[PDB]
Design a binder for this molecule. Structure first.
Ligand SMILES: Nc1ncnc2c1ncn2[C@@H]1O[C@H](CSCC[C@H](N)C(=O)O)[C@@H](O)[C@H]1O
Ligand SMILES: Nc1ncnc2c1ncn2[C@@H]1O[C@H](CSCC[C@H](N)C(=O)O)[C@@H](O)[C@H]1O
Lengths: 385, 391
């Protein structure tokens, strides 16, 4: 209804390649783009995609509080929204993961009646999971800002993953172009010693920011973090991963209520692969007899009766791709399902009808051959069950 | 050295749009693609990008254990890696977030000496942060699988975010094509009642999976989850977000050791930075435009970039090659095999650009692409972009 919109998007962490297709498409469609990114290749890429970009990084300064910068960053965006423009804000990683001005700008825009949306992106923690070869689900994940972790005395779980952002600027909220001496780092190390012990591993993690670089995945003990030359290596893009100390046992009452015992595996017994960063992690066999038996079944395998093969058309595939990749086409479609579906070339009557309704079932039926036996979407992990 | 590679990538959650540019480029370059995705439009899109794709979803079956399915999915990928092929596995969301077979296949490939890598993608949790307008940093975030949360009695923190995946299939291991009756959902609700109380908010979250759908962001009390009509809305793609019950106080020792005080004038524990979490019970109104915010905005008119600001100053040739290294996996592989041979064959690079590319060091590339001023010098300060209770 009201003219003007704010869409905030991410670039991901690794230069260019970790931007989403939809983030790119909004950057291209925007009347004005405001960006804060860490590497010049991503900045240059963004400038080739829109003619009206502004670098938000220029609003930082030595001894200027970050809060004032953030207020300024968000106001620049919201000013253009108020004039009736389609504005896009672009931030490093995921634009709402450890980011102030994005949330501020969106909330102001939203409260004043403008269309406001954040699109998700790939965060440093997403990269961490990928590079450290860990799954947040096994055995759970605690994520904190390092200074917050200390100041508010946030609880750890020695049985779950712990991830700490901003380990290289403990207790420091000022800006400097030279960065800071991380003088209060020792206060974090003391907390980690207390919680985990001096010999427990800490993984210093830095995701590759350029496509050709390797990530930093350096295991240290908590005690090694006291060494000057090791502590020196922690900076503004450093994140700490601390693996579990031990494995949590199963609760008998829950086993009973969930009907899992008629037995349950030992707490030490694992599904391959085991977390390689955990201390005293045993070797897990990737090819047990049950695995070999399942692999033997591949030779005679046919799709089950209830499997739904894709059965769509170029015309339908094109329109669904266009709706995902063309914000203007999506907006037209959302404004009038029927008028949009009428104007799409080469659709079958079923495809047209499904697009007219817009319901997920109708579109699925149009694109997937549903067998008789069917008429259960793949959550793709098992835990200790 | 050894022929063959495995790259596992994600599609993100929302159909097509939430795939990363690098995920797409690897799907296109692969000799063989194996995929497991939820929606047919993403499936169709993948099939237009590579001519040799296999749907891994066909290896599920009624009454066949998920572990066996996962062993099979992994082996189909690794078999092609061992034939010397560049193999790409594709999974919904982030391919290592609540996914078994990706980690298995990568670990096997890596242990047998093949190139193995996971590329991150947008997870259901990433979507949740974006759609619910919360930041995991404020006030921390605990993320669990719902059945694991119950079975291993995982700790909640009433002062931090809690996110629970798989709340629509509590205690269910099996596979069925028609989905499952979430009969043990009451076991979860009891635990949430114990931890938070009957009147505490639980946000039922479903990210939009097609570009035109709206997300489900439905707030219920814990008690409301006991109603049959409410409970039945929770399905296989449902996630719960449970907001903080209260705000945690600062401790004096850390305040002192971090030297964050002249006198007792740290903000009160509830004096939040705008905006406040709208899902928290008894969330106070936070003023977006305090006097200090207005003073900051007033400085915009006379603003110029600081001396030490580094304007972009690159070339078409350099932005093109850096873009190509990000979007062309074959070009990246060549560049990594021999920095100098690659750099010297790139057309139209300046001497500095060529030299920076020959070295490959981030600083050399940065200095080739940005005008680093005298003011900045070379100490030999990048924008981490949140503050907590420090200001
Ligand atoms: N290349 C990298 N590797 C590891 N952690 C990183 C990183 N870049 C940023 N971070 C983490 O993020 C903090 C900056 S806060 C901004 C994070 C960004 N919005 C995101 O989605 O990740 C850093 O202090 C660090 O903890
Ligand atoms: N559209 C959606 N909205 C909210 N949560 C979702 C979702 N799709 C999947 N999930 C969550 O993820 C679980 C499946 S497990 C696979 C998750 C996927 N790899 C990811 O990166 O998120 C579901 O039980 C649900 O908790």
């Amino acid at each position: 209804t009201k003219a003007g919109s704010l869409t905030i998007v991410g670039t991901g962490i690794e230069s260019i390649g970790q931007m989403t297709l939809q983030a790119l498409s909004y950057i291209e469609a925007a009347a004005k783009v405001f960006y804060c990114v860490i590497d010049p290749a991503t900045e240059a890429f963004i400038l080739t995609k829109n003619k009206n970009c502004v670098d938000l990084y220029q609003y930082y300064d030595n001894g200027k509080s970050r809060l004032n910068t953030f207020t300024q960053m968000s106001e620049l965006m919201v000013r253009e929204v108020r004039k009736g423009l389609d504005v896009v804000g672009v931030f490093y990683g995921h634009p709402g993961v450890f980011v102030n001005p994005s949330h501020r700008a969106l909330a102001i825009a939203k409260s004043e009646g403008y269309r406001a949306r954040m699109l998700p992106g790939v965060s440093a923690e997403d990269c961490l999971f990928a590079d450290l070869c860990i799954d947040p689900s096994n055995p759970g994940c605690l994520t904190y800002e390092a200074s917050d972790f200390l100041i508010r005395d946030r609880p750890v779980s020695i049985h779950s993953h712990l991830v700490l952002f901003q380990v290289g600027c403990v207790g420091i909220a000022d800006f400097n172009f030279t960065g800071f001496d991380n003088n209060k780092f020792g206060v974090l190390v003391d907390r980690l010693e207390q919680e985990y012990g001096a010999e427990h591993p800490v993984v210093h993690y830095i995701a590759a920011m350029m496509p050709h670089q390797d990530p930093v995945t350096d295991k240290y003990t908590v005690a090694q973090l006291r060494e000057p030359e090791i502590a020196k290596r922690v900076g503004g893009v450093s994140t700490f991963y601390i693996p579990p100390k031990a494995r949590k046992a199963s609760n008998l009452d829950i086993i009973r209520r969930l009907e899992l015992l008629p037995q349950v595996p030992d707490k030490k017994a694992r599904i391959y692969p085991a977390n390689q960063w955990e201390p005293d992690v045993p070797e897990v066999e990737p090819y047990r007899p049950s695995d070999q038996a399942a692999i033997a079944q591949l030779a005679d395998h046919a799709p089950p009766e209830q499997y739904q093969p894709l059965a769509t058309s170029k015309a339908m595939s094109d329109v669904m791709t266009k709706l995902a990749l063309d914000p203007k086409a999506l907006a037209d479609y959302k404004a009038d399902h029927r008028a949009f579906a009428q104007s799409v070339p080469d659709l079958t009557p079923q495809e047209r009808a499904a697009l007219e309704l817009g319901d997920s079932w109708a579109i699925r039926c149009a694109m997937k051959n549903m067998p008789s036996s069917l008429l259960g979407f793949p959550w793709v992990i098992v835990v200790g069950v």
